[model samples]
Target chain A: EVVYRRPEARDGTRVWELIRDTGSLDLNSPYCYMLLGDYFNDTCMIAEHEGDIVGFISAFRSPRNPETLFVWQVAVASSHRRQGIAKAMLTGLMNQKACHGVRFIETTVSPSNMASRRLFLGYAEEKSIPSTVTVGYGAEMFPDGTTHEDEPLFVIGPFF
Target chain B: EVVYRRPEARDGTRVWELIRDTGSLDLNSPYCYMLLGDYFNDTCMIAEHEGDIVGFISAFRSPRNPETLFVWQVAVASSHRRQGIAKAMLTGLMNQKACHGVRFIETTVSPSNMASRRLFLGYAEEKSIPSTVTVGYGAEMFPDGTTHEDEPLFVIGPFF
Candidate 1:
């Protein structure tokens, strides 16, 4: 059984490891995870099974629009994939006290990541909320000068 | 001559490079800098000299208290140090339109980083504002189990 809970500063390392081991997401420094766990934990979620982290989600309430919650990264251990752990963590994140007034959810998905794209779309549909996709960050916007996929923005909601 | 301005997504790479070159502060990923440029630009500041970024500061409004601005990272190129560039960028950041209602500034400084500590404390004194220090993140809170400095919180202001 998987248990869902808000991450704490102590969970930062394990969260970073889980994301790293996923081998698919853009991994940030361990210090970044520590910041998220310590400061943004109210809006983030962690899934644990047998004392090991199996899933992690990092998010923050939009500074410009407090009503919107921006999901930054989502990761699930390969061993825990296809078990709806991502969805559950996201769901649990929304129900957090820090998310009390959030009415919309926003995220960016690369075109090739259909799994991520579908996850948000399906969640919107399940909640009976409207979702829209628009131009987000362009590939060239990335500073590395390396080729990257354009990430289109996904906005879901207005639901109470 | 130094010009202060808000950073855009295009500045992300240079910002990352500047932070990495600092060699004194904790460095996050390039993608992390991109997000700061694209999403948290309002509360962030950049200093440029002849088209090259020499200083950068990342901050965000507190989701729990919109009146407070949380300063995350402050980086100044070696060549630009001791010229009051960091202090200038910080002052300009507070005067931004997005920071109109902000009344407080908060940041964490490690014990050994007297430069950073003096910067914030001196800024507060210059403005005739009150500043206080409190226990912030302990070294043990870091997940990597690596020895890190204890970062104490510094809160400045209540000034207009």
Candidate 2:
């Protein structure tokens, strides 16, 4: 069985590994990175099964909008897919942060990325910020034929 | 009498016009637009002096954390630059929003833009982010010379 929990800054190196090796986004990906200190950094989470890592998520204290977190990435390893690991991680993550009184969290999903789209849809809201949309989508080649030009990027802001 | 307060959806088109026409940033810079509309669909201030345009401030509200706001841009017509117009605009705007529970407000200033730096820093905390100095992510998220770069971005917050 996998245990869900928040990864610590000391576990930062391991969290980076999960993100780099199993997680879909690279270190160079926008809105994603290893935060070094106590952040309102409460949104990150990881899943462990039998002492091995199966999933992870990372977030940043939005410099532009500190009240809301800028979710950088979340990934469930291929071997761990369809096992509810991601959901478990999210539950643990949200609850842990909620204990700290965090009420709103935000995530960004590529318009055509099915898995992320569904995940956010489960408990997320869509907003259009055409400005940051350009930077985020413009970084990739839009591999699935999703045009970054005029793309209706989704920002699912989680609230009560 | 000029009324100054936070913006709303109906005020967006006017805000963009000011942003574009001022050349404070390049024409329709997507980053600027996204940075401005970041929080609610409405997050700017229109200064109507006796019900006419005099000056305004455009900012983004953080959704996850309610305590911070990022002032993306502020404008005062060339004829209205001095005599405390912009200062009054900032005061009135913050008074109203800060009353609604906002605490910390931040804005980035160009190194050479000493004037803006003075106005904000004089009344706020001079702070920095990426506080742990991770530069790798910023390198990839933004194009060179675009916003969020290597420049020493001076920021100020929590005037209230």
Candidate 3:
């Protein structure tokens, strides 16, 4: 496992390739990516293991809204899943000074994604404050009539 | 008719009443309605036509992301549509320099809203920023400012 990290700008074309290949979607988010990237002042990073770029992460710490560090995304290639690779990259970034004392490091996980849900729940400390809750409401027509309900959400906040 | 205006305040119950009585949703905004009753640092108005409240508008200016004002929700009472009451209310608020250098205003309409699209299109400038235009992106998600594609976005700017 020859794990390596590189700035997002350094491997530009390769980064787009992974994003295109994965096609990740964040259904519930307060802000958009263009704003976050500009806030961070740079695009973030990519990781390679055994000659294959298997995973990545992007983030921005808001100077104005100091409490939140928005984690844009993190993903490992399908072939590299369950190999402790995603964990390695996320931990490396989270343990940095720029990220410390950040109570609102948030990322939306698809409700069906048990793996990602486990990952966030596993990170929660006892005293963390849950800042905000976002729900995806979809319209549907049933046999009787149309209805809406609170969609599941994975809220992650580190207060302490 | 007591069609008068007051300065925005923290404890303005009349502002809330203006929104409630008019039943004119467009006068306030979706973002305001999204966070119902929590109108912190918001501007609101009430229009009295024939001794009763007929219309009102409430707007929220985001400090974090300035240069854009999210008109939370606006409405003209059911008894007041088609009388140019909503228009009057909007025209009055638009003239205010509250947002300072506010370049544009943004809101979302349900896909099924033809009437709203036409109304908004008539008054606001059209914007084409992509929806998934990335709030934050790092390694795997195209390094932040990655606009997904040409998504139609309409803006109410100083163009006119």
lDDT of each: 0.84, 0.52, 0.48
Ranking by TM-score: 1, 2, 3
**DockQ for all models, in order?**
0.50, 0.03, 0.06
Instruction: Give the better candidate number (1 or 3) by lDDT.
Output: 1
Residue B101 of model 3, lDDT score:
66
Candidate 2 residues B48-159, lDDT tens each? 6665566667654543555766565667766666667777766666666343566666565555666666666645532332211122222233333345432233334343
- In terms of lDDT, the poorest run of 10 residues in model 2 chain B is B129-138
Model 2 vs. true fold: TM: 0.44
Expressed as tens digits, the lDDT of each residue in A47-125 for candidate 1 is: 9999999999888888778798989898888888889998898888877677889999999899998778877888898
Candidates 2 and 3: which is better by TM-score?
A: 2
Model 2, total clashes: 5
Query: Over the stretch B1-160, how does candidate 3's per-residue lDDT look in tens digits?
Result: 4363522332233444455465332222122222222222234456776655555565545434567665544556666666766555655665666546666665444345454455455455334322211122233333355432222334556432
* Candidate 3 C-alpha lDDT tens digits along A56-159: 67755543455766554667777777776666666666666656777666654555667665556555642354544475322221111223232333446755
After aligning candidate 3 to the native by TM-score, how far in Å is the CA of B126 from where it should be? 23
- Fnat: each model in turn: 0.48, 0.00, 0.02
Quick one: best TM-score, which candidate?
1
Off by over 4 Å in 2: A1-117, A122-160, B25-44, B49-55, B58-72, B77-80, B97-106, B121-142, B145-160
> Model 3 misses residue B124 by how many Å?
24
How many clashes does each candidate structure show, in the order listed? 0, 5, 27
